[PDB]
Amino acid sequence: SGIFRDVSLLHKPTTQISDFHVATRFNDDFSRAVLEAEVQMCGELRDYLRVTVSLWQGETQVASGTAPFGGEIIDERGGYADRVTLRLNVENPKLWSAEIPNLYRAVVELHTADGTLIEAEACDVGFREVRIENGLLLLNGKPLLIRGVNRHEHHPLHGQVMDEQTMVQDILLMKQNNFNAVRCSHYPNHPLWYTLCDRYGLYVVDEANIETHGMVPMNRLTDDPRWLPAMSERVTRMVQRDRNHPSVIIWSLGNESGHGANHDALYRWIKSVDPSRPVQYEGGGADTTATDIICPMYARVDEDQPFPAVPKWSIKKWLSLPGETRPLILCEYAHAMGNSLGGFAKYWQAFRQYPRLQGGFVWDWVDQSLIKYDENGNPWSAYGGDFGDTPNDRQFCMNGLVFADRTPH
């Protein structure tokens, strides 16, 4: 517990940009795109205000649009006089992918017609389309093969405080070891992570901070309307913060919280508000009405584990169950606890052979060991129970592909 992420002060004008959404849509072959940016203001509207959204490629401005406030009519009472949407045509855009993380810069200016800037906001933009078609998760029209890993925010000295150096070290090691994607197990990450993933190129699953594993049954709270409010904020506020990052390609409703009606409602809320990314959720059997992707944890390649209610079918079999058509990407597989990863090649061989088996995210990146000191000042790696915590789950906290200090296993 504690104040574990940054604290800042931000001084905005009273008439200000209060939110902005960037979307990119394409033609059939990706040779043309439209960048659409909805901008919202707070403060007093005045006829002289304008918003200009400019797109840059390096030091070169490639597109721009300017307009006064006042959105399209939306219903019988009119439109949002406090919003405006700018539409920029972009020819032959440089596409973003984990392989070639091409980025442009969008600058959003709140200014006056006669040229005075009130304030500006901005973001890096990656032109990419993510869609599921014919049962395949496609990026810029090509099917992905997710070489992913689950990554918790963990430091052996600092606990859950993340720093730039460490984040960078992790991405470099992931890329160095042929990973192309990461799942934010199991909560929104420090803001800087998204920026680094956008720039260095990794596909990200952004996941809401909701996990109720210890309830009995697991969906006790998630099926209760009384908890929909609290849950809703965990999902909505995550979307509101992270929706403009290109690295984020899939939203996740949380983890190990069974399957409750609250999941369904929240799944639908995201689909409505941001049609640009698939929504996944593993709870309740990995193939519920709240997920666009079959996303089991620890389902085996050839072997079925037919548990009641929530079976873990062999992944090859799952794909073809009567009426199923979704892509399958394991949210967690290959439990890297101690001397492990046995059978990893089995997964890969399957992923390569079956189009709809589009990979998975190993569990997990780094061991959650903590440093303790022996009377003599020499440090050693500690696990559950080592701080007098009890009950505890002993070494279950170390499941990484690398030791806490980033040395590889």
Next chain:
Amino acid sequence: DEANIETHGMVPMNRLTDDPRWLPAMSERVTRMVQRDRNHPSVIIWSLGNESGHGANHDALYRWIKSVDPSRPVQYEGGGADTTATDIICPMYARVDEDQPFPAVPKWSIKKWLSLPGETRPLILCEYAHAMGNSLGGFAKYWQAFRQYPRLQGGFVWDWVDQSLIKYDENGNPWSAYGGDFGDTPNDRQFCMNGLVFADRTPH
């Protein structure tokens, strides 16, 4: 129940079946079969024939039957085993786990076939486990898959009985003959004996 239409030796295989001029002749082979056998409960599926590629004639005929007799699915393996003229994915000799990616007409592993993008039909091999001579190795691998996968609904082994013919020696003793033993040529030798049982019905 299958129409007496097979044009395997044509080049390409659908040369005649894609030719409207052969539509009439093909049409009688399918329609007269349905008119004759449609009241038998044992018939559960109609087949448009065998190894005649995939031609427009097949499409027309597949529709004809669907129209006249909705009570039974229609299958046809030609042209890739999963064309628009078949309600059932019905490959011949597709393997359990191993793909055989022939151009145009691949034979995918049956487990993989079920789940190709957009695929949703059941899969029943029209022919599998070629029992020629000392054979049937790997039979159990099919069965294990059939039982594990709902949509893998089995198959028809190739085939029941050896097509050997009896000939008599100089001494008048009989003996089992195959391709080429009648002076026939060219011929395909022993390929005519692929059965689980001998021509006299003794089991292999």
